[PDB]
Amino acid sequence: RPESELIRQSWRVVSRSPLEHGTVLFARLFALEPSLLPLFQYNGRQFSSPEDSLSSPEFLDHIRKVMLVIDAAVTNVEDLSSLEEYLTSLGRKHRAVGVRLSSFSTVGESLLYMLEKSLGPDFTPATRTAWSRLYGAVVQAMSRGWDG
Template identity: 90%
Template sequence: MAVVLALSLRLKALVVPNVCWLFALEPDLLPLFQYNCRQFSSPEDCLSSPEFLDHIRKVMLVIDAAVTNVEDLSSLEEYLASLGRKHRAVGVKLSSFSTVGESLLYMLEKCLGPAFTPATRAAWSQLYGAVVQAMSRGWDSE
């Protein structure tokens, strides 16, 4: 639990700068982030958007909910499937969640440093995989 608390305090400071790395891994994600019909020309431009920062906050809330409910992720099944449907509706490819997972692991490694052991990496990968699996049901349900 101490690792999760340390993570939550430091991760917020690292998320925004490392989002550029996500867009470098998969540039096709950038056009999906349009707010008020505004198309962003660069990751930095996107990062200056209050709406995008709110989206990051929401992603962090989903991660927090998954960590909080790690012993009973089934309690989040319907919520995550609904979230999957919303992502599909705006054009997100299910395969893009693999890139997002890589980016998340990268941020965790930067945040935790030596505390990001192979076991920690495996645990986060498993948790993220379970979240994506539940979200993927949103692609299949309509």
Template identity: 70%
Template sequence: MERPESELIRQSWRAVNSSPLEHGTVLFARLFSLEPSLLPLFQYNGRQFSSPEDCLSSPEFLDHIRKVREAEPWGLRSAKHCLCNIVLQMTRYLLPLQTVGESLLYMLEKCLGPNFTPATRTAWSQLYGAVVKAMSRGWDGE
């Protein structure tokens, strides 16, 4: 990834991280609206949520959002951990990677507003595409 694209990703991630719970909730709300079958993935202490709203307001899920949002997307280890978990779960539930990517772009667009430029969209799309491609080949050594 070229320097301007990586800087766009860093800047936009810093802006989104200013309110991690709000922005994380936007991402997961979109994910649940596109793929309601994901709701069973998020259980805490054996509790199944009856609706996305119930899940999105639970303290355990908010803690999950906080942890996910603390990961730096440009750090390989963080991206690898978060996205590997997503892929394992998607394999189980047959969720297309495009849905996760679309939810990420949706969150960025809603949260950044006019600062989510076409160049920023392209940079994030390229990053997400590169991570998905690497994951589809498998992670060496782990």
């Protein structure tokens, strides 16, 4: 505690409808950083517009994969060292597909946006601070996949 409990309580709301909330996360992401759009290359083709991504089964499967990684982080919030090796290889995979490490800061802001809009009154400054810390720890582990 105390960050721990704020994370578990707030995630309970989001995890009721993961694809709907993850849709908000990625809509926001492309609004902030449109140059992330070409990195989702399924069947060797590029999405033209952000709304094109929302029709792609492969893209929606990636939303589910994202939400499952965040769920594992919440389940393990008391000790994240258990996920470190997995997160390092997840970083390496994203480096491989072309994501720059700086772009994970925009992902974090999109995550915070999605929580603010979902929780409304209930997304307190303490809750924000807890999620920033948890997300920061996840990215620090992933960052090792970009060497060092």
